[PDB]
């Protein structure tokens with residue numbers, strides 16, 4: 001079936017480094033003052049035991065690229081840089097993407113490019129990813145580093161080493177494989193180190209649900225960005241599925257363009273539709289919105305399509321910039337999560353993107369918000385709550401390998417994902433023979449080592 005050929009998911013498979021062959025030269029360890037000291041010591045011994053001189057690089061939160069550029073031009077020749085900025089980092093209230101490590105990672109990268117160090121950067125994160133459903137993502141925002149990290153790898157390979165996640169508060173794994181990781185020939189740049197081995201991130205095709213389970217829309221279904229392109233198609237799908245009542249929300253709401261014939265089109269399909277103006281970044285507006293739902297038709301599902309798009313390059317991106325532009329997607333999701341955590345929802349669907357699934361040049365500023373969604377969904381599942389972060393491909397990078405999918409087909413793939421209870425399904429139509437060549441044009445990857453069509 002066409003739908004079953006658009007389904008993919010992320011898995012972590014056991015793998016190896018490829019012989020450490022020791023190191024040489026001087027490595028820098030970037031960290032904040034009085035933070036990640038235990039891990040820094042574990043990293044130092046790991047690197048020094050491999051035959052390298054380690055020096056610390058104490059970074060001041062949100063210092064900027066200019067300051068780091070001057071300091072990197074004084075250290076002299078550098079063999080590599082290990083970033084521990086995301087280690088022992090507290091979650092940022094109010095704005096999750098205001099993470100200092102996100103802003104400073106970008107600053108470090110840009111600075112490394114300016115100082116022309118000519119060496120790769122390796123970023124360590126703590127419990128930022130889950131190798132299995134039994135592991136919990138500690139801070140969903142840390143996922144943004146992996147998201148933007150993937151794009152930086154494609155735009156400036158020479159300066160990007162990779163990403164390594166280790167158990168929060170733990171150092172044993174790091175000081176045990178770090179050496180082999182930074183000096184490996186496997187080409188693994190996306191790894192998770194656990195007490196029971198090393199794992200590598202991999203794309204794999206998803207299986208069909210032989211289960212009788214079939215998600216069905218009941219009561220009221222809320223769709224953010226309902227008046228937008230994607231939210232509109234989702235609404236049409238729900239109506240065709242037999243959804244009783246649809247609540248479409250956006251900042252424009254009833255004033256949105258095309259909203260008029262939108263309701264008429266949905267009501268024609270047999271669904272009572274209501275369009276309301278609501279800014280999902282405003283927690284109070286959302287609370288009032290939810291509170292206005294008829295007791296006769298309780299909210300049962302949420303589809304969060306609200307968002308914005310850009311196209312800036314990594315050298316033009318700043319943590320502040322990213323945080324500000326991804327508010328509807330990120331804050332909208334957080335608010336909806338907090339305000340429905342008590343409701344009896346059957347589905348809570350966040351609209352993620354291929355931008356975070358594998359990332360692409362120019363999408364560096366878009367990847368962060370989508371990665372956060374992936375993490376939030378996994379956190380909800382860990383707490384016994386429903387959630388699905390669907391990484392969407394293009395909806396009908398054309399010749400880049402990704403083929404736009406028909407609205408109808410895309411929604412049936414999602415239906416199938418809800419039926420199998422997949423937390424982070426990837427729904428995209430691509431031609432691997434064309435995609436792979438472009439994705440590894442200047443940088444190889446093992447991300448697609450299990451994709452049949454990637455080996456065929």
Ligand SMILES: NC(=O)C1=CN([C@@H]2O[C@H](COP(=O)(O)OP(=O)(O)OC[C@@H]3O[C@@H](n4cnc5c(N)ncnc54)[C@H](OP(=O)(O)O)[C@@H]3O)[C@@H](O)[C@H]2O)C=CC1
Nearest residue numbers: 225228229230250251252253256279280306307328394395
């Ligand atoms: N952009 C692209 O080319 C692609 C995007 N995607 C995916 O599809 C998703 C949906 O976007 P799309 O369908 O293009 O929609 P649109 O491009 O039409 O944008 C919809 C607009 O959505 C609503 N909105 C924005 N911010 C808020 C907010 N703070 N509160 C409430 N609603 C808000 C608004 O409606 P109003 O005007 O009424 O205020 C807003 O003007 C993306 O986020 C992404 O995951 C997939 C392939 C390509």
